[PDB]
Amino acid sequence: ESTQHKLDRIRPPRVQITYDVETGNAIEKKELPLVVGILADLMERRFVEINRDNFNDVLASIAP
């Protein structure tokens, strides 16, 4: 809750002003990433995130 709206309730002034985003009847659209799980022969293990930046670090940690 914005502090502006807290002043609606806690000792409000006669002229109480807040800023609000006009959203009408819109609903929020949360987006999910695409997650690809890779199983390869390269309970305590884990799906380690891999990308172009850290690829060689993951190769080193696997140490084939």
């Binding site: 985003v21 959203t23 819109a26 949360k30």
Partner: peptide, 16 residues
């Protein structure tokens, strides 16, 4: 800004 399902809400969120 929050992302909504209407153009008006998205525009208003962005400019705010």
């Amino acid at each position: 800004p929050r992302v909504y399902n209407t153009n008006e809400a998205n525009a208003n969120a962005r400019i705010s």
